[PDB]
């Protein structure tokens, strides 16, 4: 029972025997995302103060923070907290995110 199962998987409901631990059950409020297109996120990020991979010298990557979207390195950003706050605001306001 890994620590990250808190709130996502029931810590009690497993079969006993040859399948113990391998078969699990969702927590009572667990929700599994059906996915979404990452396009609007990419358009917003490009419109924001983010610089793409091909438009940058490799020397600037070290100080800046990397941006991954769906596991794909898209570009870099120099102000991380501002971007994070803006993105969280957009997600909480049911905007394009």
């Amino acid at each position: 029972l890994h620590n990250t199962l808190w709130g996502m998987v029931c810590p009690a409901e497993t079969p006993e025997g040859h399948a113990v631990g391998l078969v699990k059950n969702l927590a009572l409020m667990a929700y599994i995302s059906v996915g979404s297109q990452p396009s609007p996120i990419l358009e917003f990020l490009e419109e924001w103060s983010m610089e793409n991979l091909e438009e940058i010298s490799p020397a600037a990557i070290a100080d800046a923070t990397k941006i991954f979207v769906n596991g794909c390195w898209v570009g870099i950003h120099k102000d991380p907290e501002q971007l994070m706050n803006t993105l969280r605001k957009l997600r909480r306001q049911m905007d394009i995110i």
């Binding site: 396009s39 358009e43 419109e47 103060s49 940058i56 010298s57 020397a59 600037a60 394009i96």
Partner: protein, 222 residues
């Protein structure tokens, strides 16, 4: 002087140009102007220890964009030109980079929503039918392709059997045209019944076995 030579007068003059990144709405507005000549103005102010840059949109075009400057020494940015006469020239080198951002913060998100809505117009998702479809597999006396093929077959008709000399004349033209041949193509060229072609070809021709594709006939009498 050559076709592939690159002219470097611009570099020798050390001409400095500005690279500006702008959003889609400004570019679309500028394009909609149909090249009238003017689309806006740019205001650069210099204080005792700071520099402010902005772009003022034309009031006519609509019916304040602050600018942020970035580092230049990271990469050497230049620009070249290619013309219809295949003459290459270098206009100059980029001396400063500019970033254009909208002054609006909350209301501009409405324009972003409209842009997203426009971008989602052509994307397609499956629809739902209230009633089962019955217009397909409709009964028909015969298929269109079948009747077309029978009409073609009855307009052209069967390939008529001819006298030995004239088919031999086609054979002569044939192995004058090309040394080796395939039985199907010979039938198509000669336009003769396959059994009659085999009968008139076996007398003079022989089949040579090949280890590459298939055994084939030889038009040479010897």
């Amino acid at each position: 002087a050559e076709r592939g030579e690159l002219d470097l007068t611009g570099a020798k003059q050390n001409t400095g140009v500005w690279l500006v990144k702008v959003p889609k709405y400004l570019s679309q507005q500028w394009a909609k102007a149909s090249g009238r000549g003017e689309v806006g103005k740019l205001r650069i102010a210099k204080t005792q220890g700071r520099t402010e840059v902005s772009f003022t949109l034309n009031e006519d075009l609509a019916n304040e964009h602050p600018f942020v400057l970035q580092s230049v020494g990271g990469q050497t940015l230049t620009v070249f030109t290619e013309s219809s006469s295949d003459k290459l020239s270098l206009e100059g080198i980029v001396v400063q980079r500019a970033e254009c951002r909208p002054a609006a913060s909350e209301n501009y998100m409405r324009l972003k929503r409209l842009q997203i809505e426009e971008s989602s117009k052509p994307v397609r998702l499956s629809q739902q039918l209230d009633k089962v479809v019955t217009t397909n597999y409709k009964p028909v006396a015969n298929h269109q392709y079948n009747i077309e093929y029978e009409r073609k077959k009855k307009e052209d008709g069967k390939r008529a059997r001819a006298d030995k000399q004239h088919v031999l004349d086609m054979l002569f033209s044939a192995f004058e045209k090309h040394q080796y041949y395939n039985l199907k193509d010979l039938v198509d060229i000669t336009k003769q019944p396959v059994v009659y072609l085999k009968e008139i070809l076996k007398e003079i021709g022989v089949q040579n076995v090949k280890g590459i594709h298939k055994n084939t006939w030889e038009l040479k009498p010897e």
